[PDB]
């Protein structure tokens, strides 16, 4: 039930020009994974029952960057600040979600539809809504389902975002990439999850919880066998995530 707001022609022109500048900047800086993490941690605080949190620009606030789950995302905010200043008409909320969409595209992933119009909100949500990497399937459903309002399919598809990037012992404490090509958006996260622990690669307990759940596991198997189906479900889930609490 989405009803996207009207924005001026000047706003739309800035969206299009920022999208191109973000492509070049994110590719040059090699920061696609960090920008995807920034957009996801912006959006993933949404609570459907209270309509609080969500992708409304609050992740730039020092109070929210200080949340433990956001360790290292101040690097991403600082990286984007000069470019954001070239587009004063855009909300921070739209700019960070656009950066996440671009991060997926420039690494070869699907083209996630983007609609402008998010307004920046004044207060960050309370800490503690983002998922815990040491927990399992029940926790995943509490966070993605009971709070955000996403489906079990969305959970598995979105966790394929770990197909790009790595953990860092100085940030979360976990260390290493999920896949052998961590700047290439493909279905290798599911390939590695199924194949078992390879040396040099890393999987979180929350990743491994997908394998034993009766709903998540068929989805893992489908995405490992069919990258096209992963790309379709990923783009659907990323769009929903980026629009939580927005336009209904
Ligand atoms: C659902 C449970 C999830 C958990 C428990 C989780 C946890 C983590 C952790 C612990 C890290 C390592 C941070 C660090 O040490 O640098 C990380 C990185 C990352 N996460 Fe997730 N995450 C989840 C879902 C997602 C989703 C839904 C997305 C996006 C669609 C995502 C995108 C990323 C990316 C791209 C990185 C790599 C960042 C980099 O390379 O600097 N994650 N995640
Ligand atoms: K990959």
UniProtKB/TrEMBL annotation:
- Record keywords: Calcium, Heme, Hydrogen peroxide, Iron, Metal-binding, Oxidoreductase, Peroxidase, Potassium
Q: What cofactor does this one take?
A: heme b
Regions of compositional bias (Basic and acidic residues) in chain numbering: 116-136
Domain (Plant heme peroxidase family profile): residue spans on this chain: 73-248
Coiled coil located at which positions?
none
Q: Where does L-ascorbate bind?
A: 29, 34, 171
Q: Where does heme b 2 bind?
A: 40-41, 162, 166, 168, 172
Q: What is this protein called?
A: L-ascorbate peroxidase
Q: Which gene encodes it?
A: apx1
């Amino acid at each position: 039930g989405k009803s996207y707001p009207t924005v001026s022609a000047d706003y739309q022109k800035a969206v299009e020009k920022a999208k191109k500048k973000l492509r070049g900047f994110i590719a040059e800086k090699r920061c696609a994974p960090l920008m995807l993490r920034l957009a996801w941690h912006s959006a993933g605080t949404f609570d459907k029952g209270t309509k609080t949190g969500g992708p409304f620009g609050t992740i730039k606030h020092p109070a929210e960057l200080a949340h433990s789950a956001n360790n290292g995302l101040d690097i991403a905010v600082r990286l984007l600040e000069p470019l954001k200043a070239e587009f004063p008409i855009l909300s921070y909320a739209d700019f960070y979600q656009l950066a996440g969409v671009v991060a997926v595209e420039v690494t070869g992933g699907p083209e996630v539809p983007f609609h402008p119009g998010r307004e920046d909100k004044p207060e960050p949500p309370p800490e503690g809504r983002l998922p815990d990497a040491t927990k399992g399937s029940d926790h995943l459903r509490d966070v993605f389902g009971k709070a955000m309002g996403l489906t079990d399919q969305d959970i598995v598809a979105l966790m394929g975002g770990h197909t790009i990037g790595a953990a860092h012992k100085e940030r979360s404490g976990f260390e290493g990439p999920w896949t052998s090509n961590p700047l290439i958006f493909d279905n290798s996260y599911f390939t590695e999850l199924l194949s078992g622990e390879k040396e040099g690669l890393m999987m979180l307990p929350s990743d491994k919880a997908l394998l034993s759940d009766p709903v998540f596991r068929p989805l893992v198997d489908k995405y490992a066998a069919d990258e096209d189906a992963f790309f379709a479900d990923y783009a659907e889930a990323h769009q929903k995530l980026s629009e939580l609490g927005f336009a209904d």
